[PDB]
Amino acid sequence: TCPFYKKIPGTGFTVDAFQYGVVEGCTAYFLTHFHSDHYAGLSKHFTFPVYCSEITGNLLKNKLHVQEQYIHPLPLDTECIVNGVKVVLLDANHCPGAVMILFYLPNGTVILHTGDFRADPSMERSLLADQKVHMLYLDTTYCSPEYTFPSQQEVIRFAINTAFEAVTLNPHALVVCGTYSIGKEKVFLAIADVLGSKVGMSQEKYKTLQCLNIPEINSLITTDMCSSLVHLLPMMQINFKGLQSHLKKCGGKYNQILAFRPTGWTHSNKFTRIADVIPQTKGNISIYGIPYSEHSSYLEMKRFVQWLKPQKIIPTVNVGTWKSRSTMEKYFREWKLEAGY
Ligand code: NI
Numbered sequence: 001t002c003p004f005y006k007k008i009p010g011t012g013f014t015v016d017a018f019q020y021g022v023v024e025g026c027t028a029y030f031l032t033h034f035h036s037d038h039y040a041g042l043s044k045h046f047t048f049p050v051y052c053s054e055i056t057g058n059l060l061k062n063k064l065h066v067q068e069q070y071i072h073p074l075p076l077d078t079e080c081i082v083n084g085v086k087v088v089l090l091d092a093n094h095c096p097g098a099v100m101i102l103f104y105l106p107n108g109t110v111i112l113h114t115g116d117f118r119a120d121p122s123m124e125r126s127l128l129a130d131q132k133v134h135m136l137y138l139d140t141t142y143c144s145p146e147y148t149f150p151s152q153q154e155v156i157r158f159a160i161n162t163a164f165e166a167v168t169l170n171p172h173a174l175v176v177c178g179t180y181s182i183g184k185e186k187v188f189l190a191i192a193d194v195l196g197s198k199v200g201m202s203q204e205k206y207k208t209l210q211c212l213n214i215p216e217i218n219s220l221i222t223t224d225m226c227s228s229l230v231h232l233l234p235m236m237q238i239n240f241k242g243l244q245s246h247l248k249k250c251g252g253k254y255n256q257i258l259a260f261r262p263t264g265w266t267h268s269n270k271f272t273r274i275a276d277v278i279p280q281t282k283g284n285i286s287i288y289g290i291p292y293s294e295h296s297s298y299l300e301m302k303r304f305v306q307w308l309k310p311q312k313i314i315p316t317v318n319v320g321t322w323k324s325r326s327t328m329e330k331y332f333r334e335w336k337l338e339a340g341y
Helices: 054-064 121-125 152-169 185-194 203-210 240-249 298-308 322-339
Strands: 013-015 028-030 050-053 071-074 080-082 085-091 099-104 110-113 135-138 173-179 230-234 256-263 280-282 285-291 312-315
Touching: 050 054, 054 071, 054 203, 071 080, 121 298, 135 298, 152 173, 152 185, 152 256, 152 285, 173 185, 173 240, 185 230, 185 256, 230 240, 240 256, 240 285, 298 322, 312 322
Parallel strands: 013 028, 028 050, 050 071, 110 135, 135 312, 173 230, 173 256, 256 285
Antiparallel strands: 080 085, 085 099, 099 110, 280 285
């Protein structure tokens, strides 16, 4: 059955709760963003109202084939009424179309559900600052002090300079970027922009990108692999074997590959700075691991929560074991004692 952390008290609303069949009492299902864990169970067969951003609606319509009658897209940064209750969608700084949702309950309680997010200080001057938030449903993916990472901009700058140098040294090199869902699009778009190229990709991936309201998209992406010097491949193909194989397929138009694997955190965040990063190399193929994160680091999460000062925190990630929950509760108490709420 639908867990209490996906239910909004004193409404018949749920959030990211599609895998449990019909939820008893639920009159509106919210979807924070288009990642399969969150949408799991949604298909052309679903027949209840889904509330979401415009981008998330395009994806539901076109990729999942959810019938149009059940998609209720809402604009960002706008007070809307849903089944008698005031809501606002805010940018989550996660993947394209990802939202946080603010719920103003009839009793006067205010609840923020973050969805998946990368906390940022720009969120301190949104509509959130206008009133007290009593309850917070929090993306706790990286809720432990070991999880540090560089800013997105430091990582993109590194990617840009690396790719530009390699292709100026060898104008017959191909750049490859690995991908598995939506998100982290700036990696491949910034590399292509410094090389004066479009990004080449499969028909399924192109169809996905065409839904995302990216300005001038038709000038940035193509399905003609031949004509482009940055290609997108599935993350699973980002290895020496898969990349040699791809290079055979391109018809001797390239004689070298430089590949990027954008990942989350891995253990080498605890020593290395972005400027020290060196690739793995086998022959005419190099692979760079770059920690481009679309989740809050420990320090970014702590800052946001210490600013917000919620009366109660409800974790939404890593809640499956008592050890994880206990560990998280400890950090929430420390933050509360330091900041005086
Ligand atoms: Ni996500």
